Structures are given as C-alpha cells and as structure tokens.
Ligand binder design. Structure first.
Ligand SMILES: Nc1ncnc2c1ncn2[C@@H]1O[C@H](COP(=O)(O)CP(=O)(O)OP(=O)(O)O)[C@@H](O)[C@H]1O
Length: 500
C-alpha cells in the first residue's frame, strides 16, 4: 500500500530493535524513523519539493540511508553517484540531472567542489561539518520528528541509478515495491540481518530499504574485503550478505574462513555478473551448506530470475550454469533478431515483462523505447529456457563471436573450459581472423596444482560439447583475467592485448 509506507511500517515493526548498524553508529527502528522524518522536514525547509532532483555523493554510512529514504519520502528524485565512478562521469550525471540539491559526505568534500564548480547547483548540503553548503545533519538536528506522510504520485520516479558506458535508470515507488515483493521471494521472509557492502547510491540503498521494509537490520560496510566480511557475519549475526560471484569465491577460499562463524547466515545471495559454475561448486563444498542463491537482475528489469539454494544442490540435476526461474509475476520470452518468440530450448534475447520494469531511462526517451518495447524489456542477454523453466545465459548480445556465419557464444564456451578441472577461470572473446572474420580467443587461468594445461585437451572438450567452430583457435594460459571497474571481466583489454 505504497513503497515508502512499506519501509516506514517495517521500521515501526522494528521500532525497538536495531535497524541501521554501521561500524560508527547504531540506530533502532524508532531512532532511524526519527532521523528520516527530521531529515525530510529539513530538506523541505530548504525548498525541495516533489519531483526535485537530489544528487548525492556518499559512501555507506547510516546517514546515507536516512538521506535516500527522506529524499524519496518527500517525493523528490534521489540520484546517487557511486564513489567508485570517475569524477568526470559524476559531473556528466550531475549535469544531466535537473538537480535542485547536492548532498555530499564531508570526507569527499574535495570531489564535491570539483563537481560543483563544473555544475553549479543550489542547496549544497553536507552530511556533517563540511567546507561547502549547509550541514544537513545539523539542520535535521533542530527539526521535529513528527511523521511526514508520503503523498506524491506512486508512479513518479523517486530514484535514479547510474550505469556506465552511461545512463540513469529511473524508478518509482510502484516498481520499487514490486522489487521489494520479489526480494521477499528470493531472500525469504523478514526480518533479515542484511550485510550491505554495495553502494547505497544504487543497489545497496534499495537493498537497505527492502531490509528495513521487511522489518530487518541493515549492516553497512563500505565495500567488500573478505576478512572484514567474515568477521562482520559472526559479530553482527548476519542472515544475508549480497555478493558479486568473485566475492563468493574470496570468502570460500579465504584462510580465516575456518575460524569465522557463519551459523547466522540463512543465505549468501550472489549475482550482478557471470559466475563460474565450478567455482560456485567449490564455494558450496567449502561453506558446508546450501547458502548460495543465484540472482539475475538489472536496474532496468529489477529481479528477473533466481536459482534457489536447494537448486544449487538438487540431486537429480546440475544447475550451476543456470540463473534459475522467473520470479512470480515475471514473464520471460526468448526472442530472435526480429522479435519472434522462440520455442523453449532455443537461444535468443532474454526479454522480460514484470511490474519491476524501470519507469525508464533518465532523459533518454529514444533509448528507452528501443530497450522497452510493448512493455517487454530487451535485456541484451542471450540465453535459453529449459522444460522446467530454468534460464541459461550463454552471452551478452554484444559478446557473440561470429565465426563463418555461425554463432559462438562466449559465456557458454567459458563454462565448458572452466568445467575442466585444470581450469579455474576463463574468458572467451572474438578477435580478427583473415579466413573466418572472427576467431575464438580463450584466456584460461590454471587451478591450484595445475602445471602445463593441455590446450588440445581443452579444444577437444569444447568441440565435443558445443562443436568444432566453438573451439578456441587461440588459447592463452594466463596468470590473471583483467577486470572492469564494475564486477565484470575486461573483454576489451583481451581483444586489445591479443593484437600485440
Ligand atoms: N547472476 C548473473 N549472472 C550473469 N549475468 C548477470 C547476472 N546478474 C546480472 N547479470 C548481467 O548484468 C546485467 C545487469 O546490469 P545492470 O544492473 O543493468 C548494470 P551493472 O552490471 O551493475 O553495471 P554498471 O557498473 O554499469 O552499473 C544483466 O542484464 C546481465 O548481463
């Protein structure tokens, strides 16, 4: 009965219990709810009204979550810059935003001034003592904690999340409550004790709101470092920590895992980037129980599928190369070049329809209309369904390797390679071929205790599984697979390195 209603009621149900725990500060539900009201009235006092854009620049402090909710409670449009983003990318976003306020962490006051010289914004605000603008925690300090009722259009965008090259995904309460609803399906009923070490600016902050909504406790960390995270799980008695798949491996392999206490976890949901099945298998063996839950989502589509914990260890199937089944209410069609629905089993673009679809891309109505067509999000992912409804991603459309007019799917070839015991990690990419236009390059990282990889054994296994053309013409053993700023392997830089 309204997205912020859901958040607030969650905080009212957790009034006396912890709600926001960072390493610096701890609020109850009642304390948390009080800061939100006072922050919201403070922002209102500064002139912000429904529809006004509030760009922010902060880490994952407590103050960041109160800010996100308070801005949205007013009905304003929260637009959170990740810290990780290059400063130029931030400016371009801040400029694109019809920004009515800019709210920054003191710690980051340098960057604030570079961006604000570059985009003069009114209502510069600081989350504590700071060189620039007024101090918002002070302003809230002197404000009443009287509840502020959400009264804006549930359908109008209250959040914008940035995705690089470089786009803001707008979200309204409507689609956010549906995202909330899906989270309860994935993560189970609340209350959760949820370890968020993802930016509050974007996905970490929605996950914060979901946790609170379901009446739970957000445990904030700035980022993922496996040793801190293992300590935090036991100390803060976490029920969930959302991981990039690499992070999952870092936990499961970390020497201090043996001394850590993980008994509090119900789940370790993971997603955001392609997993290595064999590695998820090892993580599963090393953790000792079905904790892992595979989540497939996008900022545009919200949650699309999840592979449950039980399906990770289902006796009669191997499903670790699946991102699982549709969430209740999510329809999935697999479509060809022209938008024809393909029969179950065939490869095509994953197109999803649900009430979780974004409101659309910020100030990009053309691109919106190319991406969402007749209420169907075209994901740019390629995959197939199976007769039990599991989704298998084989490639991003942009990564497909065209050899002699046949389609080689890079992600699908990696899984074959990584499935090999001698291979730990792999990246497949297309490079120029005189004869076949594009040939298949695979870089493979050897497992521990593997010496010389038999590159012919590996080509055979791909031929034998996918067929001849899927065979890597070029097969480098490497130390390391380069990575992009945002959890994802750097395919450009392998294309780039392979020429020279
Ligand atoms: N569990 C999973 N397994 C494989 N690919 C996944 C995945 N979850 C997400 N993806 C991939 O990553 C996409 C999700 O990206 P978005 O949420 O839109 C931006 P992002 O990956 O966070 O990058 P950004 O740094 O530009 O924000 C999907 O459309 C799909 O290609």
């Amino acid at each position: 009965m309204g997205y912020l209603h859901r958040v607030v009621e969650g905080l009212k149900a957790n009034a006396g219990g912890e709600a926001l725990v960072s390493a610096d500060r701890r609020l109850t539900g009642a304390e948390t709810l009080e800061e939100i009201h006072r922050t919201a009235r403070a922002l209102a006092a500064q002139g912000l009204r429904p529809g006004d854009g509030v760009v922010t620049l902060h880490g994952n402090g407590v103050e960041a979550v109160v800010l996100r909710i308070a801005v949205q409670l007013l009905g304003c449009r929260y637009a959170g810059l990740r810290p990780v983003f290059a400063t130029r990318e931030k400016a371009n976003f801040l400029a694109e935003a019809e920004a009515a306020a800019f709210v920054y962490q003191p710690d980051m006051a340098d960057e604030a001034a570079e961006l604000l010289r570059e985009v003069p914004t009114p209502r510069v605000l600081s989350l504590g003592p700071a060189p620039l603008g007024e101090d918002l925690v002070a302003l809230a300090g002197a404000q009443s904690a009287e509840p502020v009722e959400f009264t804006a259009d549930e359908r109008a965008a209250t959040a914008v999340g940035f995705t690089g090259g470089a786009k803001g995904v707008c979200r309204a309460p409507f689609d956010l409550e549906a995202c909330l609803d899906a989270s309860l399906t994935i993560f189970g009923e609340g209350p959760w004790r949820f370890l968020v070490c993802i930016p509050i600016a974007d996905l970490g902050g929605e996950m914060a709101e979901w946790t609170l909504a379901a009446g739970g406790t957000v445990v904030l960390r700035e980022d993922f470092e496996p040793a801190d995270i293992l300590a935090t799980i036991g100390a803060e008695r976490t029920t969930h920590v959302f991981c990039a798949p690499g992070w999952v491996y870092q936990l499961a392999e970390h020497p201090a895992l043996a001394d850590a206490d993980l008994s509090s976890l119900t789940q370790i949901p993971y997603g955001g980037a392609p997993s290595t099945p064999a590695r998820i298998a090892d993580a599963l063996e090393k953790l000792g129980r079905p904790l892992l839950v595979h989540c497939y989502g996008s900022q545009e589509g919200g949650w699309m599928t999840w592979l449950s914990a039980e399906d990770h260890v289902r006796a009669d199937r191997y499903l670790l190369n699946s991102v699982g089944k549709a969430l209740p209410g999510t329809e999935i069609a697999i479509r060809d070049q022209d938008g024809a629905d393909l029969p179950v089993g065939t490869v095509g673009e994953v197109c999803v329809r649900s009430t979780m679809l974004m409101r659309g891309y910020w100030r990009l109505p053309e691109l919106t209309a190319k991406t969402v067509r007749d209420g169907w999000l075209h994901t740019g992912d390629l995959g197939r369904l199976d007769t039990e409804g599991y989704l298998y991603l084989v490639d991003r459309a942009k990564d497909v390797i065209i050899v002699e007019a046949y389609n080689v799917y890079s992600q699908e070839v990696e899984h074959v390679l990584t499935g090999h015991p001698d291979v730990r990690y792999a990246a497949v990419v297309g490079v120029p071929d005189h004869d076949t236009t594009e040939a298949v390059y695979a870089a493979v990282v050897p497992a521990e205790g593997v010496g010389e990889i038999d590159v012919d054994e590996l080509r055979a296994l791909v031929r034998t599984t996918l067929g001849p053309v899927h065979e890597p013409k070029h097969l480098d053993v490497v130390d390391t697979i380069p990575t992009t700023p945002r959890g994802h392997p750097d395919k450009s830089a392998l294309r780039t390195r392979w020429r020279a």
